[PDB]
Write a protein that binds this ligand. Structure first.
Ligand SMILES: [Mg+2]
Ligand SMILES: [Mg+2]
Ligand SMILES: [Mg+2]
Lengths: 40, 59, 59, 282, 63, 49, 46
RNA sequence: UGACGGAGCCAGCGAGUCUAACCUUGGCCGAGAGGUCUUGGUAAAAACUCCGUCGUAACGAGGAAUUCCUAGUAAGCGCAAGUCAUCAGCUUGCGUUGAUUACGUCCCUGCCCUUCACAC
């Protein structure tokens, strides 16, 4: 039978490791998307 | 037909206030007074009603 | 909904299945109801009526 | 107060309507500028529009964050109130506290018998910038709605696989520094809109050596939220979960405060359309 | 947590992957590890079914 | 009509409500549902205004 | 789990199918359209 | 700081020609389909005020540890709605009655910040 919507993703160990590496890379490069105070 | 909630109805601008008419229950004196012509005129008041009903539906 | 499934275990298999009424209102099987057996909850894109009949297309 | 907010919002709605009309004229001025610089002939409609050429003389000297946040983006820090549904269970109260600790300038307010129209009006007086309301089901958080004052937008989310810090033994206390923010894989115009709403909840200008990082990672429209504390080592960086974990999926976004159920819907989730599962909007 | 992290790292040179209860008189399980195995086992099972769908032969090894 | 048989353009007769459910009323069809949906939206639009 | 597999397979098959029809339609227009426009030019020459 | 009965009386949310059971015993009509009836079982504002009566196997308000909470808040009481995600093993709204204790301190525990006059 057909299903209307994709099931909610399951947080398995591999998914966490994928998330973990992305965070580690961004910190290492020190690139973050954060609000920057305007001048004046 | 749509029935506006009284809460919305109460706080409406003067230009847009829906005129909802309450039924009369105490018999008015004029309602107790008026004379209705019966018999021959009754046959001549139904008929005009019958004619106008056909004419609208035809149109 | 009722009479589609005979026990809640059947509904467990078909959770999330697409269903529609005769009227064309699409929907989903959300969850199985504990009481009575076989009843379940379904959410439709619009309000359905009692006269309507829900159908699950299976092969 | 009440008159000014009504008047200001009407002025905003009028301004947006004109800007949509003015978009065509803005494109036309761009074509004129390119032709003058490059030397290409103008299109026929522009070549014959005497009014535009005259008006171009004045308009030649004409030159991001979302409009609602533009006024105070990076100038005033946000002020946040985190509340819950009526008669909250104990677990939601603990969860509401965790959300309070997540945002540096959040305050936890008890919602016992507070009326929703009264709630926003009280918050608008006190200068509150954002309001967060949490819902629960048998002590498991299910929904989260974020409303930006004075006139919206209101973003509603559904929380899945929630794991609170209270479920951790000997976890310790958090650090409350201005955290670093990571927004990954937000590409569509809606995605940028969601990022802007979540970004402005935090104070501007975190210190460069701040050792707390918050990451919102979009993976198939299920925005994963994680909180970490990092230490820069000699051969890399090591990070540790502080929590909580939860995946939050947008399902509505309205141009108005959460009280106004009549607010125009900027975007909604259409679950029963035929091609619902095919495309991912965020 | 962060101060404890620094102390450990200077000595050397994720508590959310465990579900822990409270002793009424402690680590109870491994959700991430258990779900990976519980999801992978049905995953190879599904791969077997899709292979088995349209076959009438098969290798019969009596050894 | 070009390159089409008359058999192709045959009226498909449309069913009725089951006898077991006959109490509840007429089985709505798509045309019936459209009348409901438009009517509700028309009222809701004015009520919103 | 079966729900995840079925949806992914349907999307992939849908994506591949649309790719094929677009390919065979475009190739017919490009190559045969050239021959048509070539012939139309010869007839105009006549 | 009870149970039973009676009396008095007070809310606010909510308006899609839409709103809602199951299994049986039999009569009659009908070519059938079915129609109508008959029949047993199963299931499915409160607080508050006043008056009258009685009367004080498991468990009798829940250990250690741990969590939360500062005003229309905690707590008690019911009534509605189910609004494309979640929810009925329930969720969200609505009104009613409505407190005690703090509103100081950095002593302990954590987190954070620092090293254009006059007067200092
Ligand atoms: Mg309470
Ligand atoms: Mg209650
Ligand atoms: Mg609740």
């Amino acid at each position: 039978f057909d299903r209307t919507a994709k099931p909610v993703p399951v947080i398995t160990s591999e998914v966490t490791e994928s998330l973990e590496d992305m965070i580690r890379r961004r910190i290492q490069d020190s690139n973050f998307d954060d609000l920057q105070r305007r001048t004046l | 037909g749509l029935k506006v909630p009284k809460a919305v109805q109460k706080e409406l601008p003067f230009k847009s206030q829906i005129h909802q008419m309450k039924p009369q229950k105490k018999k008015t004196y004029m309602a107790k007074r008026a004379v209705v012509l019966g018999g021959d005129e009754k046959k001549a008041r139904s008929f005009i009603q019958k004619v106008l009903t056909i004419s609208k539906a035809k149109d | 909904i009722k009479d589609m499934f005979s026990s809640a275990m059947e509904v467990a298999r078909f959770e999330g299945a697409q269903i529609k009424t005769v009227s064309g209102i699409r929907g989903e099987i959300k969850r199985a109801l504990s009481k009575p057996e076989g009843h379940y909850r379904a959410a439709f894109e619009d309000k359905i009526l009692m006269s309507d009949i829900v159908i699950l297309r299976s092969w | 107060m009440l008159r000014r907010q009504a008047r200001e919002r009407r002025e905003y709605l009028y301004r947006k309507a004109q800007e949509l009309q003015d978009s065509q004229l803005q494109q036309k001025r761009q074509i004129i500028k390119q032709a003058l610089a490059q030397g290409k002939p103008l299109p026929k409609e522009l070549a014959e529009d005497e009014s535009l050429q005259k008006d171009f003389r004045y308009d030649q000297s004409l030159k991001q964050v979302d409009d609602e946040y533009a006024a105070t983006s990076g100038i005033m820090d946000p002020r946040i109130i985190v509340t819950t549904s009526r008669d909250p269970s104990t677990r939601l109260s603990q969860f509401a506290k965790e959300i309070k600790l997540l945002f540096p300038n959040a305050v936890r307010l008890n919602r016992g018998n507070y009326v929703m129209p009264n709630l926003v009006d009280a918050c608008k007086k006190s200068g509150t910038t954002d309001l967060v309301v949490l819902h629960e089901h048998r002590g498991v958080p299910t929904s989260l709605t974020i409303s930006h004052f004075p006139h919206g937008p209101t973003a509603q989310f559904s929380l899945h696989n929630v794991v609170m810090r209270h479920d951790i033994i000997n976890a310790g206390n958090q650090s409350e520094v201005n955290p670093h923010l990571i927004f990954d894989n937000f590409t569509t115009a809606l995605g940028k809109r969601v990022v802007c709403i979540l970004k402005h909840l935090f104070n501007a200008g975190p210190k460069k050596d701040s050792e707390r990082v918050i990451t919102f990672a979009n993976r198939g429209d299920f925005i994963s939220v994680r909180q970490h504390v990092y230490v820069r080592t000699r051969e890399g960086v090591e990070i540790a979960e502080v929590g909580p974990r939860f995946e939050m999926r947008l399902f509505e976004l309205r141009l108005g405060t959460l009280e106004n159920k009549d607010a125009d819907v900027e975007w909604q989730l259409r679950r029963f359309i035929r091609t619902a599962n095919k495309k991912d909007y965020l | 947590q962060l101060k404890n992290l620094k102390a450990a790292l200077k000595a050397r040179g994720n508590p959310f992957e465990i579900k822990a209860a409270r002793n009424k008189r402690i680590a109870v399980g491994k959700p991430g590890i258990s779900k990976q195995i519980g999801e992978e086992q049905r995953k190879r099972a599904f791969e077997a079914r899709k292979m088995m769908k349209n076959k009438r032969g098969g290798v019969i090894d009596k050894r | 009509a070009k390159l089409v048989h008359d058999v192709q353009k045959k009226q498909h007769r449309e069913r009725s409500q089951l006898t077991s459910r006959s109490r509840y009323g007429f089985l709505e069809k798509h045309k019936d549902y459209v009348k409901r949906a438009q009517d509700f939206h028309r009222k809701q639009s004015t009520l919103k205004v | 789990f079966e729900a995840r597999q079925r949806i992914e397979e349907k999307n992939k098959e849908s994506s591949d199918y649309h790719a094929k029809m677009a390919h065979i339609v475009n190739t017919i227009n490009t190559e045969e359209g050239a021959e048509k426009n070539k012939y139309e030019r010869e007839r105009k020459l006549r």
